[PDB]
UniProtKB/Swiss-Prot annotation, chain B:
The chain holds residues 828 to 917 of 1471 of the full protein. Widely expressed, including kidney glomeruli. Plays a role in coupling actin fibers to cell junctions in endothelial cells, via its interaction with AMOTL2 and CDH5. May regulate acid-induced ASIC3 currents by modulating its expression at the cell surface. Residues 6-88 form the PDZ domain. It comes from Mus musculus. This is Membrane-associated guanylate kinase, WW and PDZ domain-containing protein 1. The gene is Magi1. Part of a complex composed of AMOTL2, MAGI1 and CDH5, within the complex AMOTL2 acts as a scaffold protein for the interaction of MAGI1 with CDH5. The complex is required for coupling actin fibers to cell junctions in endothelial cells. Interacts through its WW 2 domain with SYNPO and through its PDZ 5 domain with ACTN4. Interacts with cytoplasmic domain of ADGRB1. Interacts via its WW domains with DRPLA. Interacts with ESAM, LRP2 and CXADR. Interacts through its PDZ 1 domain with NET1. Interacts with ASIC3 and AMOT. Interacts with FCHSD2. It comes from the Eukaryota.
């Protein structure tokens, strides 16, 4: 994923 | 090698406004990814991408899992606010 979509959004 | 910060955020309707990375493999740190423009974290101004997350609402997450930290954030979302303790390399 591109850095803005990586990880879980909280 | 770090500075530690204790950050309080009120939740917005859209959440706290940041992405959480890491804690997927044993020993892998949990840390801040993308911060959403004009979200709670951005507005507050203290959180930075790359900060290591070490505590959420008094529960330590050092050496702990991505799953745990997301669970703690979901509990914080329910209550409408969160306390983050982070460390950043300096």
């Amino acid at each position: 994923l591109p850095f803005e979509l990586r990880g879980h959004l909280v | 090698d770090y500075q530690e910060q204790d950050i309080f955020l009120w939740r917005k309707e859209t959440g706290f406004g940041f992405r959480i990375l890491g804690g997927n493999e044993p020993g892998e740190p949990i840390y801040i990814g993308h911060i959403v423009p004009l979200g709670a974290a951005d507005t507050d101004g203290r959180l930075r991408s790359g900060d290591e997350l070490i505590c959420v609402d008094g529960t330590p997450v050092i050496g702990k899992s991505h799953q745990l930290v997301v669970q703690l954030m979901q509990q914080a979302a329910k209550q409408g606010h969160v306390n983050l303790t982070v460390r950043r390399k300096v």
